[PDB]
Amino acid sequence: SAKAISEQTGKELLYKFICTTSAIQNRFKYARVTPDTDWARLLQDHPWLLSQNLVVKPDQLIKRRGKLGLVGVNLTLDGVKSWLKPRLGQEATVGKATGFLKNFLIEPFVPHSQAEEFYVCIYATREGDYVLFHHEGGVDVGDVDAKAQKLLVGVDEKLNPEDIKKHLLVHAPEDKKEILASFISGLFNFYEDLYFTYLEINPLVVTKDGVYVLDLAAKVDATADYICKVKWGDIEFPPPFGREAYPEEAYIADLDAKSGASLKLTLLNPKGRIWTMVAGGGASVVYSDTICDLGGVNELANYGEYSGAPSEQQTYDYAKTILSLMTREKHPDGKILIIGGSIANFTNVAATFKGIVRAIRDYQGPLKEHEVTIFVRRGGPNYQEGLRVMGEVGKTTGIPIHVFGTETHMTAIVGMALGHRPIPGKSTTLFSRHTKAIVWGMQTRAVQGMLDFDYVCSRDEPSVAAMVYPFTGDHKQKFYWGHKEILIPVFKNMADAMRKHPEVDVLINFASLRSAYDSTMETMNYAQIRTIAIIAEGIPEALTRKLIKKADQKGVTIIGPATVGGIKPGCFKIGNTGGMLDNILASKLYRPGSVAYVSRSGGMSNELNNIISRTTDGVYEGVAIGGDRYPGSTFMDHVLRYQDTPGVKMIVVLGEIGGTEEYKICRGIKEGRLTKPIVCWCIGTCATMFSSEVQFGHAGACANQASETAVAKNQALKEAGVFVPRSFDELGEIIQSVYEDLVANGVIVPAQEVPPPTVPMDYSWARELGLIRKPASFMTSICDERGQELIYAGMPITEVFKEEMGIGGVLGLLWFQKRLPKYSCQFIEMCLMVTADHGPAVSGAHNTIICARAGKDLVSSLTSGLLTIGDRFGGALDAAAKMFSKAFDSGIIPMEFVNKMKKEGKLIMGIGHRVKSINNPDMRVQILKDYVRQHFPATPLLDYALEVEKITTSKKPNLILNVAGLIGVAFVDMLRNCGSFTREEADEYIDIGALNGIFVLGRSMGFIGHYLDQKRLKQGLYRHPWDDISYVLPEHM
């Protein structure tokens, strides 16, 4: 989208970035004057003010300043100081817009004569860039396109100095031909290097000292921000005069520029009572046209749109921003929120409406005390759930919300919100039934919708032959052909896909705005591709022009970027056109018709689908060429195709504001090239009722001249012989009348309605509706991965970290689903610490080291070490705990327990040490025992184990409570002595092996440490010495 930049920014960029042999004068030599600044600082940082003369003019995107007396020429510092006060901060009226004066520019006065008043204008066109030079420029420039010399520079073509000298310098003075020509060349390099779309210097004054750019008006391609970021810096786009910028608009612009989706917001009247939530640029344009058609232009507050399938978070942010905007003031008549839109092709209505209802619930109070009434109309994917959540939020919040679906004609809600009605070479045939397409990008939903469309169209083969995704290896992706399961190849590179599929003739490019250009350029290197569909929005106009030039050279038809694509009922479908399969069947797009339509918008293309299905036989072919300034194929490129197609009988055109394209259709009708009936409507009639220059959501929706207004186009088409309705409301009626008149003469013969093949319902869609029953095969109660926040056994992770538990608390939550006390978690941590490692001589550490010295893996080595954890090694914890628990519960005294163990030929688990007996204890048993004594409330089993330990140490000193036995008895005591567990729960946790898990988790740290040690020491493969192995093999078996 071309956005006008201020004079100061334009001159700043020109001075910093132009590269000319001519000595550009007054580089960075200017001052900015605003109401909210001091004046001494302006003198101190700009000492040149006193040095020479001054001239002041408001830098607020206002033209005709000299004719309106807004410029003070040849005034000193005191002169301009006295000049500003009667105008600085005052009110002024230019054309139709009234506004303040918050910006002024001070620059040195240049002593120049009228003989050097030059004019240099470079503006972009579809075929290239027009550069116009006028020797007698300035105020007396007069007509420019008829008197000033014009020169075209084509796409990917350089502006040579010789051509500037010859074509552009016929009447220029000879003494200044050369340096000026070099300056012109540098200016063109500045225009095409910073992605400018308009650059008019008027006047340009060159004297013997050098060149001076007195004034310049510049419009730059904003969508090229990702290319010219370092050169633009923090570039700012001033709003049109009479309109003040708002922080909410900047926030929405940042949100739009932060993602590939479109989020346009423009505040026209903050005092207004009508606010809109319309999805789709054309949908928002027609909604605004309806609003100002009933006299709500003055009370219309904002123009807004959300497109490109915005996420739930993005839609919530947009809705909350507009709700904050709408709840500032109060209105005696109340306020209206029009949440409109077309029948969405791929915009998830459910997620966007969930975000909207979240914003409404966050703002329910101010909304209900503002008497805000909400009218919602929407269709598309999962619109039933969106309308349902709208109804529930309106019921719960108390907001009067009226929700409607497809059956509404998209404009009843506007009329009955303000109270008017009651509230209830390039080929001709691009696609055929044998068309095979390659899809760039991982878009499984779009390809599945394409396959469903093909199946319900009784196609022999799927229309998608292969997919291209550069971020994965070649494989096969699983898709549905009706109910059958099929595989579609996915290739990393274009070359392999075109090698294995020479029958592919169409590319559907789902690459982003940062990859669509390169992908399309690579695709046009293969001659088999005749049609390319570009879905990305926000491509720079220069790159799009390069794409158009290459496509015209190669004779490849391009469906312009920022489009949903197109639909040919019975033959082919592009991307997400026509919505899901339910919308395809509702609009009967599985069978050919007799009406062919072309529109700029994608959602309006689905609206046209619905209208044509309702009122006529059906749709033969529908193409959306995109909202960009330069579509790959224009209106004429498709109207000519339809006129050459015998299958169509009438053509419907849905144009927009800006662009002299419908006049080409008018000329073709005049010359008799177009004979079939045409019904055309141009949206954008509200732009003539606006005291502004508001830019619509579509990039190309901007009326440059006065002949590109929608009203003028519609008027000319009415005198062109085109059936033009009074408004978009009457479009359905006029199309129906034309269809009836054409079928009454026998031109149209509707075919027999053959029922389409049926496609089985989606399992997820059926589960969402609650139509089917499938039992869950798994149960879990320790962790909830789904949702906004991770949950550990009912506790959010943020609350887990705020409660200041550590490994012990998380372990308790995950293993026992209990909120353990602080001492229990700390004791669990100590148990993990003391069982971390016990040297490399144990079986598990030995196995881990053996697997590590084989250079296998961390996971494999740790796993091999852990697989030895069992009865003989690492099981003394659970065994000791079970033995002591059984002894304590049996009621036998410790001496009886010792005697029973002795007479059964069993050694007491957890009793006995190797060196440390008494007066030199374990130093691991002591720390844990002290902690348990100090912190545990009651330790019955620990006392029983200590009595058993006394009895065993009365036999021989080294029969002490082991670390395993102590940890087991203390873990049982913690389980059955804290309030978290009942006795049954503790017994079950002991039975299932909680202490086995404790030991394994503790020793895993040591095993991983051993693996890391062996990999750091770079130890080679181990082989056991033969002298350590006794071979007792039989004599001969």
Ligand X SMILES: CC(=O)SCCNC(=O)CCNC(=O)[C@H](O)C(C)(C)COP(=O)(O)OP(=O)(O)OC[C@H]1O[C@@H](n2cnc3c(N)ncnc32)[C@H](O)[C@@H]1OP(=O)(O)O
Ligand Y SMILES: O=C([O-])CC(=O)C(=O)O
**From the annotation, which residues make up the binding site?**
57, 65-66, 108, 110, 117, 215, 256, 259, 261, 308, 345, 347, 363, 378, 717-727
| Tokens 């009447």 found at | 171
Sequence-distant (≥ 6) Cβ neighbours of residue 820 within 8 angstroms: 808, 809, 812, 828, 978, 980
Distance in Å, CB of 901 to ligand Q5B, minimum: 6
Closer by beta carbon to ligand Y, 451 or else 842: 842
Q: How many whole angstroms separate alpha carbon 995 and alpha carbon 888?
A: 18
687 CB neighbour count, 10 Å cutoff:
25
Report cis status (omega within 30 of 0) of the bond before 366: no
911, interface contact from ligand Y, ligand ADP, ligand X, none, CB < 5-8 Å by kind? ligand X
What residue 763 binds from ligand Y, a copy of itself, ligand X, none (CB within 5 to 8 A, per partner kind)?
A: a copy of itself
Q: Which does 909 bind (CB under 5 to 8 A by kind): ligand X, a copy of itself, ligand ADP, none?
A: ligand X
Q: What is the size of the binding site for ligand ADP (CB under 6 A)?
A: 17
Return the number of the residue (739 or 1007) whose C-beta is nearest ligand X. 1007
510 lies in the site for a copy of itself, by CB under 8 A: no
Nearest CA among 218, 211, 205 for reference residue 119 = 205
- The answer to whether the beta carbons of residues 221 and 542 sit under 8 Å apart is yes
**H/E element, 796:** strand 795-796
- Token readout for 274 is 């009508």
Give the interface segment with a copy of itself, choosing from 215-223, 256-264, 600-608, 699-707 (CB under 8 A). 256-264
Q: Per-residue x/- mask for a copy of itself, residues 998 to 1037, rule CB under 8 A?
A: --xx--xxx-xxxxxxxxxx-x-xxxxxxxxxxxxxxxxx
Closest C-alpha among 688, 449, 690 to residue 575:
449
Nearest to 452 by CA among 564, 580, 568: 580
Exactly one of 749, 915, 934, 984 binds a copy of itself (CB under 8 A); which one? Answer: 915
Binding mask 136-155 for ligand ADP (x = CB under 6 A): --xx----------------
Q: Please say whether the beta carbons of 855 and 847 come within 8 A.
A: no
Q: Nearest approach, Cβ of 472 to a copy of itself (angstroms)?
A: 8
The residues in 910-939 that bind ligand X, with binding defined as CB under 6 A, are: 910-915
> Within positions 951 to 970, which residues make up the interface with ligand Q5B, using CB under 6 A?
952, 955-956, 959
Buried b / exposed e along 859-892 (16+ C-beta atoms within 10 A): eebbbbbbebbeeeebbbbbbbbbbbbebbeeee
Alpha helices, DSSP H, located in 589-709: 603-615, 635-643, 662-670
N-terminal to C-terminal alpha carbon distance within the chain: 89
Q: Which residues make Cβ contacts (< 8 Å) with residue 502, sequence separation at least 6?
A: 528
- Per DSSP, the three-state class of 255 is helix
Residue 32, H or E segment: strand 31-33
Which one, 118 or 275, has the nearer CB to ligand ADP? 118
- From 15, 109, 237, 815, residue interacting with ligand ADP (rule: CB under 6 A): 109
The rounded distance, in Å, linking the Cα atoms of 298 and 919 is 96
806 contact choice in a copy of itself, ligand Y, ligand X, none (CB below 5 to 8 Å, kind-dependent): none
Q: Which residues contact 995 (CB under 8 A, 6 or more apart)?
A: 877, 878, 881, 967, 968, 971
Q: At 75, phi and psi to the nearest 5?
A: -125, 140
Question: Which parts of 40-69 interact with ligand ADP (CB under 6 A)?
Answer: 55, 57, 63-66
Name 484's Cβ contacts closer than 8 Å, sequence gap at least 6. none
Q: Does 169 bind ligand Q5B (CB under 6 A)?
A: no
Distance CA 851, CA 667 (A): 83
Closer residue to ligand X (CB): 180 or 911 = 911
Taking CB under 6 A as the criterion, the residue among 267, 279, 488, 845 binding ligand Q5B is 279
Task: Return the number of the residue (299 or 537) whose C-beta is nearest ligand Q5B.
Answer: 537
Contact between 948 and ligand X by CB under 6 A: the answer reads no
Candidate segments 460-468, 650-658, 959-967, 1003-1011, binder of ligand X by CB under 6 A: 959-967
870 to 899: interface string for a copy of itself, x by CB under 8 A: xxxx--------------------------
Nearer of residues 163 and 225 to ligand Q5B, judged by Cβ = 225
x-or-dash pattern for ligand ADP, window 267-286, by CB under 6 A? Answer: --------------------
Residue nearer to ligand X on the CB measure, 441 or 910: 910
- Which parts are annotated binding residues for citrate? 308, 345, 347, 363, 378
The angle subtended at Cα 541 by Cα 536 and Cα 544, nearest 5°, is 60
Q: Which of 313, 322, 305 lies closest to 258 in space, CA to CA?
A: 313
Among the listed residues 96, 285, 273, 289, the one whose alpha carbon sits nearest the alpha carbon of residue 692:
96
Partner interacting with residue 915 (select from ligand Q5B, ligand ADP, ligand X, none; CB below 5-8 Å by kind): ligand X
Residues 927-956, one symbol each (x = binds a copy of itself by CB under 8 A, - = not), give x-------------------------xxxx
Site string for ligand Y, 959-998 (x = CB under 6 A): ----x-----------------------------------
Q: Which of 749, 771, 841, 1037: binder of ligand X (CB under 6 A)? A: 841
Minimum distance from residue 283 beta carbon to ligand Q5B (Å): 5
Active-site hit among 698, 838, 1024, 1036: 698
874 binds ligand Y (CB under 6 A): yes
Q: Is 167 a catalytic residue?
A: no
What would the two tokens of residue 426 be? Answer: 């390039």
Q: Please, which of residues 954-993 interact with a copy of itself by CB under 8 A?
A: 954-958, 988-989, 992-993
Closer of 482 and 875 to ligand Y (Cβ): 875
Which SS3 state, helix, strand or coil, does residue 621 take?
Answer: strand
Using CB under 6 A as the binding rule, whether residue 307 contacts ligand Q5B is answered as yes
Tokens of 195: 């992605």
Give pairs for 414-423: CB < 8 Å, separation 24+: 414/287, 414/290, 414/291, 414/294, 414/296, 414/338, 414/340, 414/375, 415/290, 415/294, 416/375, 417/274, 417/336, 417/338, 417/373, 417/375, 418/274, 418/291, 418/294, 418/295, 418/296, 418/336, 420/294
| Residue 618 CA to its chain's centroid (Å) | 34
The two tokens of residue 199 are 């650059």
Which residues between 197 and 236 bind ligand ADP (CB under 6 A)?
A: 202, 214-215
With contact defined as beta carbons under 8 Å apart, do 131 and 120 qualify?
yes
189 contacts 202 by C-beta, under 8 angstroms: no
Q: Which amino acid is at 757?
A: P
Among 199, 252, 536, 883, binds ligand Q5B (CB under 6 A): 536
Q: What is the DSSP letter of 237?
A: -
Helix (H) or strand (E) holding 1032, with range, is: none
Q: Specify the amino acid at residue 701.
A: A
Where is the binding site for CoA, in residues? 717-727
The residues annotated with a catalytic role in the active site are 698
Residues that bind ligand ADP (CB under 6 A): 55, 57, 63-66, 71, 73, 107-110, 138-139, 202, 214-215
Binding site for ligand Y (CB under 6 A): 838, 842, 873-874, 963
Positions that interact with ligand Q5B (CB under 6 A): 260, 279-280, 283, 307-309, 341-342, 344-347, 380, 441, 510-512, 514-515, 535-537, 562-564, 602-603, 902, 907-908, 911-912, 952, 955-956, 959
